[PDB]
Design a protein around this ligand. Structure first.
Ligand SMILES: NS(=O)(=O)c1cccc2c1c([N+](=O)[O-])cc1[nH]c(=O)c(=O)[nH]c12
Ligand SMILES: NS(=O)(=O)c1cccc2c1c([N+](=O)[O-])cc1[nH]c(=O)c(=O)[nH]c12
Ligand SMILES: NS(=O)(=O)c1cccc2c1c([N+](=O)[O-])cc1[nH]c(=O)c(=O)[nH]c12
Ligand SMILES: NS(=O)(=O)c1cccc2c1c([N+](=O)[O-])cc1[nH]c(=O)c(=O)[nH]c12
Lengths: 388, 379, 388, 379
């Protein structure tokens, strides 16, 4: 029975919910658990699923050169095949034989979802700072009274009506027919015109800039701006990609990361994911494309994928140099890719089994006006009854 | 000397402008030629560049079972190392040994860059969501009712004038009825400013959003016809597909007249443009990007790669250079050479017309025409 | 008498206006003609000004390696010193001895001056295409007449007044008091509101974009956009700077130039200068900083300098390897730079002798309204007299 | 081994973060160290890096006539090749032989990046040029006169209301007088829209223009005090200057109390910031750019280089490496190395408050206060 060496990394492999009830190769489920099954079916090789005792993908001990993880299991002749998300890299392929890629991974940017749906009820006041709304109400009462004094028709219940009507630019009523009174109206009209023009102009400024801001969609975008903090992992090739790169865009990124504080290199991948979710659109974690898609397709469904692939990588099946099954596996992997079976399994374990299946002004943006209108009309009805 | 073989498929291989003066391997320029140098320099091997005579990539002629094109040259000893954009397939792999993919491609969607959209009839409502417009009418009725109800203790005419920044017909004198007027005067002010301001962003900033944004979207929309190649790998990929998305595409294409399957690539690249964006092409992700960055630069790309393929260097069974070459490819990929070459060779207001606001002239004409009927009805 | 070899390139050297009347070293004038004089004064070496018979700065014959121009004169022992704008380059300094730079030149971008001062009289109509102004006048007459028909107070001389007043949003007059008539007013008011709001919104779009456009001020700016066509000269180091460069910004520029058509490499420097002047802000010639400043400081005074120096170069005095005057000249050049004499001469020949010594809305931008207002009031006066 | 000498003037030389672990030439990082490598590799020479003990650049002590600092080390055989930002001067050149300038610098102007400007009292007039505002008043008088003149065949009140998008007091019924009203109603409409639209661009787009834009400008303006160094080359450059621009600067500084000449560089870099932009520093064009790209990144640069200087590598008289080094410098300059190193080590809306519109509240308060007097005068 061929000994398989796979790694416990969702969704590729993950123990079943009620796994204690099961035994053997049936206790495990995951993308890899279907890939190995399908490959066996074609070739015809009994496969006993075994788990990497340690939990490392593979990296020769810097001190003793000893191979670790499943890469070590293969070379040391303890596992005849390796079905896992094992990247095709020199060091690895220098000791083992890799199958043609089954999933072209790459680098991708993770950010939080827009979630920009909190238009406060009183959002029609943002252009003009409340301190001016406190200075208008006073000025209005301050102006209305002066129009009464200098005119003693223009009583104290009609002056408030003229001043209020003049400010809203829909007022005719009765015009001041005294030179002294007309002075008050003229300055109030000039005061009215500036405020209305200022409010209209400033409001357009708020909307256009919010319409011009765009989310990051490329590597240049993430680097040209330093507002969002973009970090990777301390270990792994997620950062090495830049420690020996040559493209200007990448070179700049490395500089920012190695300088910005605190440590952008999160201790673990799980930390980076949480950081983005708990930063309100201020941290952009960098992780492999495959795992990036998985995270976005699970609850709380707040992360997202932007752009494409900065680099080009690929996974594959692994076998020791000189295995009796180097051609059969390679042909079977190609046969699955042509038949679309890899896309079927990818869809199943990423979307089908994903808990989450899939410019204009809204009423909320102007909710404050519609509320002070229903309440205002409600105040009137009371008055009409109280006077009655 | 090693007789390398490739194909004159731009931008992978092309003839240098001054091809007549140049001699030897220097006569040809492209991505493959640069890639060839990177490999040779690594393995220290003298290599001569040749071109396949029939220009075919490789397809076994079942009638004769003789491999044609580049794949044929390799299996019959007439070639050496095909450094060409040859896709990795099962049938090819049975006769030749490929290398680890230098670059990865996938079927894509090819459409013309979105040109200025035709202004819809009622395009003068965009600043405020159509929902709001309904609530504005509902609020107009609300206030108009209150005015009458309060007064009993011309209302519609007053409210209509106040909303549209016009003069006031009358002036309420009661406290009960002045509150109703003041609030509405304010409500409309915010609206008028909200419409005017938002309408400015719509004109200042342009977006020209593309209709098709992914694969699924394209399939559903029937207006935008999508055609592949009559003999390309794409057509086969769909025929043998069972993913509902691609399934529906087959059905559509099977009964899509006039025939959408362009004979060659040239035909498709032209047809797409001359169709004003009503036609879409499904080709590889490499030639698509090249065209988008090739004059007149009028086509675009939308949607993720439907299926994953891979271009690879091929070697005859048992070639002594199989491992040297493979390892050299991987070295370039980690060093960024495979990407430096690819990026280099591939990538390196308005006055408002009548159409934008036409809608209101239809309302006006209608209004000033319906008005007449009312007089006829009355008298 | 020390033989000097200078080049006829303004303003460094240029024959006097009435030069035929003069002879000897007094016939020539220019920046270099003062530099050589000042150096002599300090050292004390009789200098006979001689002109390079050919007219080439210096470049060994690709076929015969023979040195040409003043660089050839020095090596071949025909000139003891070379006072000229001779750049300090390897090839040259490998055969002759250069003095410490007297003028730090570099690369610079030449463009035409803004000259954006042509606001047509009728510029208040740009936001709304004339075709809509033709559709408003008709609609106005079309609406005014319908208000008359359905109401037969609202005659034919008062309906034109109400319709005109309603459109300008300053009208009260008399309100339609018939349900049939009120329908006409309501739609006209809705028609009025949209046009005014559309005009105000669209006008803001024109101004903000014209306020956001900015002239090129760096090398990235010129490359990121392909609207302006930037070219150099076919010969000279003005283009070589990029044929072997390594900076991304520069590498991109070379690509554009070698591809864009027609030939961006102007036959001569004079062609490039004329091209910019005769392209309406569409050609950006690239030339040395020193000559760039000179051109901008001469009639018709239309070119300009933007940005700084993409590279770093330097001129100097030249002498043959082993000249009896290598230290005296070098010390004298440094003595002039400290004393500010070089800046004095630079100012004199670039600015002092330069024929050219050195956001808001203007009345022109709204000139059409003020004209149709004076004429309109002039029409009224006629009517008032004709009726009288 | 060659004992190279330099100076710990950042960014030219600095200690690597992990200096304690590193040994030898690797302990120091900077521009000079990178430049040293480029030269050594070219000339194939083993070089050891040393630091000048007293940190001085070089100034002859007239009392003893002994050269100090880096220049002293060279002339006294205790050093070799000073690859340092040593400026080329006449006195230095008499004892040491420099190289062709690797990089060129010049005196500059150092100011704090322009922060949001305080809103002027009458900042509500910016959209329309102050000229227009005058002609608007002139046009108001023009029409008001015509109305009376025409009618004779309240005028000021009508015109004032019409201009400020308010209601109409009356309605002229004569053709003679209706023309006068219609044109003004139109004129104001264009103005109101022109003000509202232009005011939007002023808020949307921000410019934050810097007060000082060149040398001449700085000299004239007295508010923005400009100070140099108490012992730096700059101070000497001005003292011996006769260009009117710099002349005036000397006069100002000679009687500029409190003393503007900052003792060190650090003091100037701080003083400039803590002065909220009222103080300006005149330093070199190299340290200025470094600070602008150094945290907290709050300073800026304005104006062209007042005078031209040059940093150069120095050699003792008759050094056998004088020509090798010089030629190596020129090679780097043409190859772009001198610039690659320099660029790398150096460079690598809002809600309107009351202040913006305050002016109108002063007009209003004034108007509603002047109005009262008129009543007192009348009665
Ligand atoms: N899960 S992960 O967080 O994205 C992730 C992070 C870091 C390294 C990974 C890795 C994954 N992976 O995708 O499972 C596979 C993989 N394969 C290799 O061969 C290797 O060397 N490193 C990795
Ligand atoms: N250029 S194309 O129009 O998109 C295109 C269209 C159709 C078939 C192609 C093809 C390209 N290509 O891109 O390089 C390569 C390629 N290679 C093979 O081996 C093969 O069988 N068919 C093809
Ligand atoms: N005048 S120019 O049109 O700008 C100009 C154009 C082309 C080459 C120039 C050059 C100038 N120059 O500035 O006088 C000096 C100079 N010096 C050299 O040593 C050399 O090789 N080439 C040149
Ligand atoms: N860093 S600084 O604050 O602008 C500065 C201020 C003052 C003197 C400096 C100087 C620098 N510098 O820039 O490198 C170099 C330098 N070199 C000399 O030889 C000399 O005498 N004085 C100086």
């Amino acid at each position: 029975t061929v000994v398989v060496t796979t790694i416990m990394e969702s969704p590729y492999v993950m123990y079943k919910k009620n796994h204690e009830m099961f035994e053997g190769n049936d206790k495990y489920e995951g993308y890899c658990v279907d890939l190995a099954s399908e490959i066996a079916k074609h070739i015809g090789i009994k496969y006993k699923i075994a788990i990497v005792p340690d939990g490392k993908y593979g990296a020769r001990d810097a001190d003793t050169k000893i191979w670790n993880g499943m890469v070590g299991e293969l070379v040391y002749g303890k596992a005849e095949i390796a079905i896992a998300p094992l990247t095709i890299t020199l060091v690895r392929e220098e000791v083992i034989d890799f199958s043609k890629p089954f999933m072209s991974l790459g680098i991708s940017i993770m950010i939080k979802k827009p979630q920009k749906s909190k238009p406060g009820v009183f959002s029609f006041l943002d252009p003009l700072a409340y301190e001016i709304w406190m200075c208008i109400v006073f000025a209005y009462i301050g102006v209305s009274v002066v129009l009464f004094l200098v005119s003693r028709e223009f009583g104290i219940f009609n002056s408030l009506w003229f001043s209020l009507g003049a400010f809203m630019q829909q007022g005719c009523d009765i015009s001041p027919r005294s030179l002294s009174g007309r002075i008050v109206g003229g300055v109030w009209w000039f005061f009215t015109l500036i405020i209305i023009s200022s409010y209209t102009a400033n409001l357009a400024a708020f909307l256009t800039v919010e319409r011009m801001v765009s989310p990051i969609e490329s590597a240049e975008d993430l680097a040209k701006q330093t507002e969002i903090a973009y970090g990777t992992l301390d270990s792994g090739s997620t950062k090495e990609f830049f420690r020996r790169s040559k493209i200007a865009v990448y070179e700049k990124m490395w500089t920012y990361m190695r300088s910005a504080e605190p440590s952008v290199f999160t201790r673990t991948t799980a930390e980076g994911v949480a950081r983005v979710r708990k930063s309100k659109g201020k941290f952009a974690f960098l992780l492999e494309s495959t795992m990036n898609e998985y995270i976005e397709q699970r609850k709380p469904c707040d992360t997202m994928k932007v752009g494409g692939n900065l680099d080009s990588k690929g996974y594959g099946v692994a076998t020791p140099k000189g295995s009796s099954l180097r051609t059969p596996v390679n042909l079977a992997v190609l046969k699955l890719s042509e038949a679309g079976v890899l896309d079927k399994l990818k869809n199943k374990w990423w979307y089908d089994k994903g808990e989450c299946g899939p410019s204009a002004l809204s009423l909320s943006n102007v909710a404050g006006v519609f509320y002070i209108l229903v309440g205002g009309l409600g105040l009137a009805m009371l008055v009409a009854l109280i006077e009655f």
